[PDB]
Amino acid sequence: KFVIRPATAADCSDILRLIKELAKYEYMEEQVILTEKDLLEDGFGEHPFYHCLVAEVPKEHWTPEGHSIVGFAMYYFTYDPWIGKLLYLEDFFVMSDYRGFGIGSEILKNLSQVAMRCRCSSMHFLVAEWNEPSINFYKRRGASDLSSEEGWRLFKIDKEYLLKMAT
Amino acid sequence: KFVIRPATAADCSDILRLIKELAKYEYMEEQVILTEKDLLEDGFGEHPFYHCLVAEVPKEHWTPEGHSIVGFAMYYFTYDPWIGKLLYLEDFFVMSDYRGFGIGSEILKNLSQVAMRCRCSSMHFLVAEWNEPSINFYKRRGASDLSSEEGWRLFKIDKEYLLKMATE
């Protein structure tokens, strides 16, 4: 039906494709700036800054445009002063026409396995507060809403302001 | 008065010392299971999963015990599908008896530089919604509240549950 496997440098084109396609079903929008060149250099170079799992379909169930990659998950490892290494799920998208055969659910299984094999106490990730369907889903898998529990809010300081502080 | 610099393997005992002090200072009741060995293997073994900056003071070594490291900052690189590499500030702490010296503001400066030299688009971090001061300290400094604007909430699935999904 479909196989979930760790991406290889050759999957970057597909990943950018799924990232752009992911940047459509999203609402905060903001077109993608990354290039295929970035995904390669940042994920398959000296030190990988992100890792990806890819959903590959047989030569039979390819994309109308002719693609074998119908899904992906992006993750990396983080650190917590109290307990140590954690697995961080940055994002995971699965193409529309292929979003009902368990691909996503299989992706979560593989990530959980990466979490065990890498000695991660837990896996963190973000969920938009309005996405109630996604909230309950993860709730059913034992996830805890730390923002509601501890009040955590995500903050950002972009290049502009970093430049001021730095200089 | 003091100097901020990248941590070394020899500063791990100091880092943990400061983490255990950050924990006490914390309002949450979190026990530190992290050990010096952990900070060593994860920070100075092959691939560093975290990076630390430490604040060092001259012969103003605290008392008792007498240490030259009065504060630290922990950070690591993350990734965003839209813009790429980001700098992620996990934590920073300055001993009670040393705050109000500008260490906390100098630390943020070195981080900004790391972000600059490491090709990072932004610097992300968490702030408790009740810590009005920090929220102000970061805003006006350019910080934007992403949870407020876009509704992002932090979620976590602990090991026990990761185990279930991994096996079952």
Curated annotation (Swiss-Prot), chain B:
Catalytic reactions on record: an alkane-alpha,omega-diamine + acetyl-CoA = an N-acetylalkane-alpha,omega-diamine + CoA + H(+); spermidine + acetyl-CoA = N(1)-acetylspermidine + CoA + H(+); spermine + acetyl-CoA = N(1)-acetylspermine + CoA + H(+)
Pathway: Amine and polyamine degradation; putrescine degradation; N-acetylputrescine from putrescine: step 1/1
Flavoprotein in keyword set: no
Binding residue positions for substrate: 25-26, 90, 124-126, 150
SUPFAM superfamilies, per database record: Acyl-CoA N-acyltransferases (Nat)
Domain N-acetyltransferase positions: 2-168
Keyword Manganese carried by entry: no
Record: active site: 138
EC id: 2.3.1.57
Annotated compartments: Cytoplasm, Cytosol
UniProt GO molecular function: diamine N-acetyltransferase activity; identical protein binding; N-acetyltransferase activity; spermidine binding
pH-activity profile: Optimum pH is 8.0.
Binding site for acetyl-CoA: 92-94, 100-105, 131-134, 138-141
Pfam families the UniProt entry points to: Acetyltransf_1
Class in the EC hierarchy, top level: transferase
GO-annotated biological processes: angiogenesis; polyamine biosynthetic process; putrescine catabolic process; regulation of cell population proliferation; spermidine acetylation
Oligomeric and partner information: Homodimer.
Family according to the record: Belongs to the acetyltransferase family.
Disease: Overexpression of SAT1 and the consequent putrescine accumulation might play a role in the pathogenesis of keratosis follicularis spinulosa decalvans.
PANTHER family (alphabetical): DIAMINE ACETYLTRANSFERASE 1, DIAMINE N-ACETYLTRANSFERASE
Protein function: Enzyme which catalyzes the acetylation of polyamines. Substrate specificity: norspermidine = spermidine >> spermine > N(1)-acetylspermine. This highly regulated enzyme allows a fine attenuation of the intracellular concentration of polyamines. Also involved in the regulation of polyamine transport out of cells. Also acts on 1,3-diaminopropane and 1,5-diaminopentane.
Protein name, UniProt field: Diamine acetyltransferase 1
Species per Swiss-Prot/TrEMBL record: Homo sapiens (Human)
This protein's encoding gene: SAT1
